[PDB]
Write an enzyme that holds these catalytic residues in place. Structure first.
Site, PDB file in Angstrom:
ATOM      1  N   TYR E  26      -7.985  -1.110  48.205  1.00 24.84           N
ATOM      2  CA  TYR E  26      -7.245  -0.293  49.149  1.00 24.84           C
ATOM      3  C   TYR E  26      -7.907   1.069  49.294  1.00 24.84           C
ATOM      4  CZ  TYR E  26      -5.315   2.182  45.128  1.00 24.84           C
ATOM      5  OH  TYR E  26      -5.163   2.922  43.980  1.00 24.84           O
ATOM      6  N   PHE E  36      -6.927  10.161  50.148  1.00 22.56           N
ATOM      7  CA  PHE E  36      -6.339  10.574  48.882  1.00 22.56           C
ATOM      8  C   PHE E  36      -6.502   9.554  47.766  1.00 22.56           C
ATOM      9  CE2 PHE E  36      -2.886   8.252  50.919  1.00 22.56           C
ATOM     10  CZ  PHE E  36      -2.356   7.513  49.884  1.00 22.56           C
ATOM     11  N   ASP E  37      -6.868   8.314  48.078  1.00 22.83           N
ATOM     12  CA  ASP E  37      -7.073   7.297  47.055  1.00 22.83           C
ATOM     13  C   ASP E  37      -7.956   6.197  47.620  1.00 22.83           C
ATOM     14  OD1 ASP E  37      -6.856   6.425  44.481  1.00 22.83           O
ATOM     15  OD2 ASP E  37      -4.905   5.450  44.732  1.00 22.83           O
ATOM     16  N   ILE E  56       4.554   1.064  45.279  1.00 22.45           N
ATOM     17  CA  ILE E  56       5.493   1.530  46.289  1.00 22.45           C
ATOM     18  C   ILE E  56       5.893   0.361  47.180  1.00 22.45           C
ATOM     19  CG2 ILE E  56       4.648   3.893  46.192  1.00 22.45           C
ATOM     20  CD1 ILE E  56       3.023   3.307  48.711  1.00 22.45           C
ATOM     21  N   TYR E  82       7.042   7.296  48.548  1.00 28.49           N
ATOM     22  CA  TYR E  82       7.154   8.621  47.934  1.00 28.49           C
ATOM     23  C   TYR E  82       8.233   9.487  48.580  1.00 28.49           C
ATOM     24  CZ  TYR E  82       2.975   7.649  45.220  1.00 28.49           C
ATOM     25  OH  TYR E  82       2.072   7.103  44.339  1.00 28.49           O
ATOM     26  N   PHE E  99      -3.045   2.678  54.842  1.00 27.38           N
ATOM     27  CA  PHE E  99      -3.800   1.954  53.829  1.00 27.38           C
ATOM     28  C   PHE E  99      -4.677   0.904  54.489  1.00 27.38           C
ATOM     29  CE2 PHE E  99      -0.185   3.507  51.362  1.00 27.38           C
ATOM     30  CZ  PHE E  99      -0.822   4.020  50.252  1.00 27.38           C
TER      31      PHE E  99
END
Lengths: 592, 434, 186, 263, 107
Positions: E26, E36-37, E56, E82, E99
């Site tokens: 991902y 961010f990831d 999540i 979140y 994502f």
């Protein structure tokens, strides 16, 4: 180089390539410019595409005055020409913009009231053309970051635009979207009534609705027919283009009108709900200029182009990966290569101090903050920063420290704080330990051997921001320690030979910048104990070949190094002695 | 003066105060670095004794009272209106001298910095003012560095003001240094301060400069320079195809870049316009280029999703056919013979258009320019002429780099100056009027 | 360089003289190097005097006499291992009544106008211990009851008998040879 | 030629550097001479290392590893300022260490690791933090005091080691005497346990230390309790709650093992 | 909930079941386009189990509708991901996450 001119510069990195050096230049003692260099010299060229930069305080055409806003007057920014009227004055159109953009909403929805002002997302600024500056030479509105057009003759028809029309399978246009970088109106046509500027200078009002993306212009209290509709998430920079026919050109009024929120609320997040107009020092007038340099990349993509045959056409093939780390300025929506900071001092200093702040917020076992920082500074960016040779020395040291503090400092401290203790278990491995490796009383290589003393446990957690579990926060983030080990060994091996030649172009600019971060990383890895057997043997040979020969190159101990590097070498030699002491203690217990 | 008073009856010793502040700063100047060790230690000892005597006699509170009394006036003009022209002229200088004197009185002394803990809250209340921001920040830096107790007073309301100083006043590394000193002092880390600074500064991604690795992107274009103009012999419809022999989705951590379409030049120059030369920008990342990645339509660096039969990112064995009609500005695409339900319309036509492909590492693509050079897999739409027909007679069609600089040896690199305008693309017949 | 480092550390302004293992080791080494220690011939005794003079010169020619005074002054009258090592070093360099070392110390004190040296000397004398009959009785009762004291020598009584002897031997060596100038300076 | 030994290599190298250049960095000079002294005094390394050497059986390896990890977690709290999140870590570590069997089986390894200093220094950092502001985080201080009392009770040698830090605990002894439900969990309690039922330590106890406690008792008899009068208790001239604690400490100091220490 | 836009097709028959581990790569991106990831940056596949609330719920429901070998874009609204408190230090409050997810293997 002039028009249609081709030239080549040879810095004499390879002396054989210099055609006339021997006949004229070698005997006289003159040296090639790049004679003592291992890496290619970086060349900087003049930028073809103009950019927006703050008006210099010493500019000989443009002067900017910051008028603080009183209780009854809005804060104003005033643009004037100092050299007007006199010889060498600038008659060309000057492009001005504000330094901060307005952010349109991501998803478009589909006494002045305090509640209405708190709930609204509509912002406003006004531009006052001074009586005497012809409004036909002044345009007001908004522009985006993509605007890099510098034409001596500007017109609203020449602005770049495109209309993306998406349709269904049948072909009906179910939406048509117009996209442009310039959304501006002309004051000459905006003066619809006529004589409106004469009695009082035109106050063109620009109204933007961040919730709907509707740009509406008001001139002298009446709403002009011209309007624009922008895409969501569009960043709009207030801008005024003007050809000056007057010493005083125009003014940037940061005021507000009925039911419209002031511009400082849309620009600044801290003043999101402050109806009082403000002009913080960050906001400043910028102008489009051509005085910038561009850094030519050291390496380009390797692309092979060839015509395969009559039928098969032309083949374009690129197969090797090439990457660069880019610095993004949030306010200007611009991105530049981080290697361009070798000539930008303020950005270099601010980013070095930002790296120091990154290393400080996660200092002393703040594993949660380290996990958070893994999102901002990634593993590939850390590895590229470690490997890169053209990186500035300050950024090199900062990224080395960031890697060490984020991934390695916790366990390095854990092992150091339990170093002068010796709890050795009573097992057969302990019994097998002896002072000397063989019958001959010859000391073995320090570190290499069988150590059975109890040592802290290495544990790491994988940084993931899609997992709701909070048990990952304990233990520092995981890193590819084997890859880091191989990289450190390779770069130390290279630097040993590179420094010994005393080249004029060390990595980072100085011998200290070349060696201190790398030796610090090596020392951290050695303390954590990742190095095993053959790696330790090779690095001990690098430190000193003759003394640590297993049974022409000069090790680090004999290269006439700077004092900061000497201190790190002292630390390494201290660690080796500590390893010998631990081996002695273990052998004593074995005999006991 | 604050109590309504007649101005000239008030005797305000402006010059004497300025001269006394100038003398006091020299009286507390730190020792110079090039001095010998013993002399430097003696000067440091004398400075410490002077600071202790001043703090014991309470000269810090007097300076604080003067500063507080001078901040009642918003600006130098306001102070000049209240008192007089000379007072207004000297107001800013007196404030700066007072702040410098306070910094010199508290610098290096731990007891003074500990006694300043109570006044810390009063000091941060005027950090936002441009009249005293630098002096207040320097005093704050000295107090935080020298006093472990001072950190315990700093709360969320004090940290957020310092952070918002960065937003309002712009990038300043002294604020970053103060924030660094907040986290760790004397080898002890304040985890609450660390957490607050992280949670209040990092997630915004709006003040600190951001970093990311971007794949290099290069562009290939044919020789043809086709455009439209009044009174010209240029055909207004063109067509060409691109075939993907092999592509790798992820040669690195970032996705492989592969975009095809048309691009234009600014004016009649043969140089592509509006785009940067070397970097991660490709077809569709500026308002001069028009791209198609198989799922989106790219123009101006904004991507809009376009529908197609069996939508997918460009894969191996994909034939992309591009159509450009300059009679009515329109760029249309067809993938594998099916029509893409989207098109670019009404773009600027005051330039020269050429085919272009942008890519990163891990591709193998082929231009089917038609005719001798290429063989069309799909029959061109009626009216559109293939792109090989636009080559000038004496010129030879070839695919070269869009930008002038490529990968080669340094001393063999051909540095190129500005190129002459290529007006020969549009042959406008202009006989002499007679 | 080592002597200059140790002197600069002493001259550095500090509230308390922090214990330094490097100084406590190298001062002992430098003190032992000076002394390096049936009728003996006059030639042999003369040779042993000249060897001691050479071994003392090898240190006081590099600034050890100005170090031992600085460390004592920085001690600020607090008895400790650093002060004990400094006193031993001073005794080692001053053995035999070395006139050169005496002159160097007196000249340094006069030119620096140092009051901390004499204040620390008074403080050390005030801190010097004497016989403690109460401690002796407590130790005797503890031994008599049956448990053995951790220290068999009764070191608690007469806490430091070597430090006091070294401190007064230093002051005797300072005036040995009827050095009237330093006698009056004291 | 070849030095053939790391000791010889360092001894040659460091002198060579010093005689080649005048080093301006005091840190470099200090490290240089420390390393040279370590090379020359080889036996001193053993003299220092052997007292820190302990030997354990193979069956206790896992328990020793867990105890060392808990000790590392407690030790790492020394470099951070005290807070609510660190209180839980300190309490959990202390509980685990008392539950671990090695804590009881090997008191000499306990004393060599020397947590009896680490717990004290953490506790006194907390006490100094907000001293005049009265103690914050009182439950960790109570836990530390109870842990120290247990450490004293484990072995007689541990009690003697604790006795060395007796005076300092008694300046830091007016902390929580007035606070109820804190009984048996104060530095005064730790001091009392340091001299509880040991003739040797009772005799080694000095006179000024008793003078300090008597001074505290006189102050408590002269002045009321500020905390109690702030909570609203009826003001009296003297402080029974504070005085009784010092009285109990003097009782433990003077009376030992049924007999009475005359001195 | 979450939209799924298919970037690359999959087999279209093998979907995750209850009690089965999903192995995915991902790439986390905010609505403004800032990463961010990314599991590809760490060069390790991400494994999680369906129905165990280990991730999540937006990610979970988005990956549940995917097939084997499929690459798709998952847009998680600020309610499935979140909430409004956000992830301290990484995700701003009331943020929408995009994502790019590829389902490697179901084991």
């Amino acid at each position: 180089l002039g028009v249609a001119q081709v030239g080549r510069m040879n810095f004499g990195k390879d002396v054989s390539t210099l055609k006339y050096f021997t006949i004229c230049g070698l005997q006289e003692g003159y040296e090639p410019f790049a004679v003592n260099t291992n890496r290619d010299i970086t060349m900087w060229l003049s930028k073809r595409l103009p950019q927006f930069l703050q008006v210099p305080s010493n500019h000989e055409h443009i002067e900017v005055t910051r008028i603080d806003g009183t209780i009854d007057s809005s804060p104003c920014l005033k643009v004037t020409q100092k050299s007007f009227g006199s010889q060498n004055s600038n008659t060309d159109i000057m492009f001005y913009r504000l330094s901060m953009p307005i952010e349109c909403a991501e998803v478009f929805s589909k006494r002045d009231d305090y509640d209405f002002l708190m709930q609204t997302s509509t912002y406003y600024y006004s531009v006052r053309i001074f009586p005497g500056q012809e409004p036909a030479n002044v345009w007001v509105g908004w522009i985006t970051s993509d605007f890099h057009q510098y034409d001596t003759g500007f017109d609203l028809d020449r602005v770049r635009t495109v209309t993306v029309t998406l349709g269904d399978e049948k072909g009906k246009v179910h939406e048509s979207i117009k996209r442009s970088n310039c959304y501006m109106v002309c004051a000459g046509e905006s003066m619809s009534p006529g004589q409106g500027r004469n009695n009082n200078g035109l106050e063109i009002g620009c109204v933007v609705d961040a919730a709907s993306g509707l740009l509406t212009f008001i001139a002298n209290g009446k709403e002009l027919s011209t309007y624009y509709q922008v895409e969501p998430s569009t960043k709009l920079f207030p801008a005024v283009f003007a050809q000056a026919t007057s010493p005083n050109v125009f003014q940037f009024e940061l005021g507000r009108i009925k039911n419209v929120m002031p511009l400082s609320a849309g620009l600044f997040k801290s003043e999101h709900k402050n109806p009082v107009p403000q002009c913080p020092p960050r906001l400043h007038v910028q102008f489009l200029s051509h005085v910038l340099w561009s850094r030519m990349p050291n390496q380009f993509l390797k692309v092979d182009v060839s015509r395969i045959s009559e039928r098969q056409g032309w083949l374009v093939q690129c197969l090797d990966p090439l990457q660069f780390m880019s610095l993004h300025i949030p306010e200007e929506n611009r991105s530049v290569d981080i290697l361009e900071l070798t000539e930008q001092e303020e950005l270099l200093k601010f980013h070095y101090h930002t790296l120091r702040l990154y290393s400080a917020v996660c200092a002393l076992g703040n594993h949660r903050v380290a996990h958070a920082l893994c999102s901002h500074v990634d593993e590939p960016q850390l590895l590229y920063a470690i490997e890169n040779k053209y990186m500035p020395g300050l950024l090199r040291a900062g990224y080395y420290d960031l890697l060490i503090d984020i991934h390695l400092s916790s366990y390095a401290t854990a092992r150091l704080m339990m170093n002068n203790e010796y709890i050795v278990p009573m097992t057969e491995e302990t019994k097998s330990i002896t002072l000397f490796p063989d019958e001959n009383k010859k000391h073995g290589l320090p570190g290499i051997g069988l150590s059975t003393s109890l040592r802290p446990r290495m544990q790491f957690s994988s940084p993931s921001f899609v997992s709701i579990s909070n048990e990952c926060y304990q233990y520092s983030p995981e890193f590819p320690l084997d890859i880091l080990k191989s990289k450190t060994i390779q770069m130390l091996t290279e630097a040993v030979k590179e420094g010994s030649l005393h080249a004029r172009d060390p990595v980072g600019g100085t011998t200290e910048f070349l060696f201190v971060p790398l030796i610090k990383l090596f020392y951290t890895l050695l303390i954590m104990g990742i190095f095993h057997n053959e790696d330790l043997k090779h690095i001990l040979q690098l430190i000193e070949p003759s003394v640590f020969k297993e049974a022409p190159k000069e090790g680090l101990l004999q290269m006439k190094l700077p004092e900061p590097v000497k201190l790190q070498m002292c630390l390494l030699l201290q660690y080796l002695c500590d390893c010998q002491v631990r081996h002695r203690i273990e052998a004593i217990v074995a005999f006991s | 003066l604050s109590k309504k008073a007649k101005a000239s009856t008030v005797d305000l010793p402006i010059e004497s105060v300025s001269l006394s502040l100038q003398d006091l700063i020299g009286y507390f100047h730190p020792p110079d670095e090039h001095l010998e060790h013993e002399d430097k230690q003696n000067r440091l000892r004398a400075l410490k004794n002077r600071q202790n005597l001043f703090q014991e006699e309470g000269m810090i509170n007097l300076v604080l009272e003067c500063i507080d009394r001078l901040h009642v006036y918003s600006s130098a003009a306001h102070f000049a209106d209240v008192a007089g022209r000379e007072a207004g002229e000297s107001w800013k200088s007196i404030l700066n001298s007072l702040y410098e004197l306070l910094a010199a009185l508290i610098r290096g002394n731990r007891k003074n910095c500990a006694q300043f803990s109570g006044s810390l809250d009063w000091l941060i209340s005027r950090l936002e003012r441009l009249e005293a921001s630098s002096g207040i920040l320097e005093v704050l830096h000295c107090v935080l560095v020298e006093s472990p107790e001072a950190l315990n007073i700093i709360k969320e309301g004090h940290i957020k003001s310092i952070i918002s100083l960065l937003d309002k006043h712009g990038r300043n590394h002294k604020v970053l240094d103060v924030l660094c000193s907040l986290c760790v002092c004397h080898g002890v880390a304040v985890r609450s301060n660390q957490h607050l600074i992280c949670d209040n500064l990092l997630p915004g991604r709006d003040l600190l400069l951001q970093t990311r690795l971007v794949n290099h992107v290069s562009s290939m274009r044919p020789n043809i320079f086709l455009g439209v103009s009044e009174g010209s012999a240029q055909y207004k419809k063109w067509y060409y195809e691109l075939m993907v022999d092999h592509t790798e989705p992820f040669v690195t951590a970032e996705a492989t870049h592969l975009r095809v379409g048309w691009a234009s030049t600014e004016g009649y120059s043969p140089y592509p316009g509006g785009g940067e030369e070397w970097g991660g920008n490709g077809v569709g990342d500026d308002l001069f280029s028009y791209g198609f990645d198989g799922l989106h339509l790219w123009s101006g660096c904004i991507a809009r999703t376009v529908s197609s039969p069996n939508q997918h990112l460009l894969r191996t064995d994909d034939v992309i056919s591009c159509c450009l009609d300059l009679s009515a500005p329109s760029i249309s695409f067809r993938i594998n013979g099916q029509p893409v339900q989207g098109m670019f319309e009404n773009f600027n036509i005051d330039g020269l258009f050429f085919p272009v492909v942008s890519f990163s590492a891990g591709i193998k693509v082929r231009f089917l320019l038609g005719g001798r050079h290429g063989e069309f897999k799909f029959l061109p739409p009626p009216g559109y002429a293939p792109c090989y027909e636009a080559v000038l007679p004496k010129e030879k069609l070839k695919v070269e780099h869009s930008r002038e600089y490529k990968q080669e040896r340094t001393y063999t690199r051909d540095l190129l100056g500005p190129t002459v305008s290529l007006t020969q693309a549009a042959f406008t017949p202009i006989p002499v009027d007679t | 360089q080592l002597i200059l480092l140790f002197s600069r550390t002493a001259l550095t302004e500090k509230c308390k003289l922090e214990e330094d293992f490097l100084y406590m080791a190298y001062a002992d080494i430098m003190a032992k190097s000076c002394h390096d220690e049936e009728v003996k011939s006059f030639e042999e005794k003369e040779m042993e005097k000249q060897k001691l003079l050479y071994q003392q010169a090898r240190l006081h020619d590099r600034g050890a006499a100005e170090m031992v005074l600085q460390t004592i002054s920085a001690s600020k009258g607090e008895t400790g291992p650093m002060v004990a090592a400094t006193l031993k070093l001073g005794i080692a360099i001053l053995n035999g009544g070395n006139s050169t070392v005496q002159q160097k110390m007196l000249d340094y004190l006069k030119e620096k106008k140092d009051v901390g040296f004499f204040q620390s000397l008074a403080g050390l004398m005030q801190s010097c211990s004497v016989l403690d009959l109460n401690a002796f009785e407590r130790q005797n009762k503890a031994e008599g009851l049956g448990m053995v004291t951790e220290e068999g020598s009764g070191e608690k009584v007469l806490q430091d008998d070597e430090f006091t002897c070294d401190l007064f031997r230093f002051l005797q060596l300072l005036c040995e040879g009827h050095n009237s100038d330093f006698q009056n300076y004291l | 030629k070849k030095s053939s030994t790391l000791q010889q290599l360092i001894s040659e190298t460091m002198v060579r550097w010093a005689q080649e250049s005048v080093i301006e960095d005091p840190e470099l000079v200090r490290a240089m001479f420390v390393l040279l002294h370590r090379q020359y005094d080889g036996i001193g390394g053993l003299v220092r290392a052997l007292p820190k050497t302990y030997t354990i059986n193979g069956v206790s390896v896992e328990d020793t590893i867990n105890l060392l990890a808990s000790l590392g977690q407690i030790r790492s709290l020394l470099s951070v300022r005290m807070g609510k999140e660190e209180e839980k870590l300190m309490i959990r570590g202390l509980g685990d260490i008392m539950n671990n069997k090695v804590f009881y089986q090997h008191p000499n390894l306990m004393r060599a690791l020397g947590m009896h200093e680490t717990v004290m220094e953490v506790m006194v950092n907390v006490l100094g933090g907000g001293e005049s502001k009265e103690i914050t985080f009182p439950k960790m201080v109570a836990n530390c005091c109870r842990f120290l009392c247990y450490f004293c009770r484990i072995s007689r040698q541990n009690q003697k080691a604790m006795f060395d830090h007796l005076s300092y605990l008694l300046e830091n002894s007016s902390v929580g005497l007035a606070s109820p439900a804190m009984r048996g969990s104060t530095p005064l309690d730790v001091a009392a346990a340091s001299v509880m039922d040991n003739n040797e330590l009772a005799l080694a106890l000095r006179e000024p230390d008793l003078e300090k406690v008597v001074r505290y008792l006189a102050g408590c008899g002269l002045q009321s309790c500020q905390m109690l009068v702030s909570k609203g208790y009826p003001d009296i001239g003297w402080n029974p709650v504070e005085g009784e604690r010092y009285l109990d400490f003097l009782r433990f100091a003077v009376f030992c093992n049924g007999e009475s220490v005359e001195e | 909930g979450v939209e799924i836009e298919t970037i690359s097709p999959g087999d279209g028959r093998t979907f995750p079941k209850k009690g089965q581990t999903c192995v995915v790569h991902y790439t986390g991106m905010l609505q403004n386009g800032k990463k961010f990831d990314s599991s590809r940056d760490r060069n390790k596949p991400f494994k999680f189990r369906i129905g165990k609330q280990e991730v999540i719920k937006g990610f979970e429901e988005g990956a549940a509708q995917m097939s084997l070998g499929q690459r798709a874009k998952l847009t998680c609204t600020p309610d499935v991901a979140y909430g409004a408190t956000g992830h301290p230090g990484v995700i701003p409050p009331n943020a929408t996450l995009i994502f790019d997810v590829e389902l490697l293997n179901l084991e």
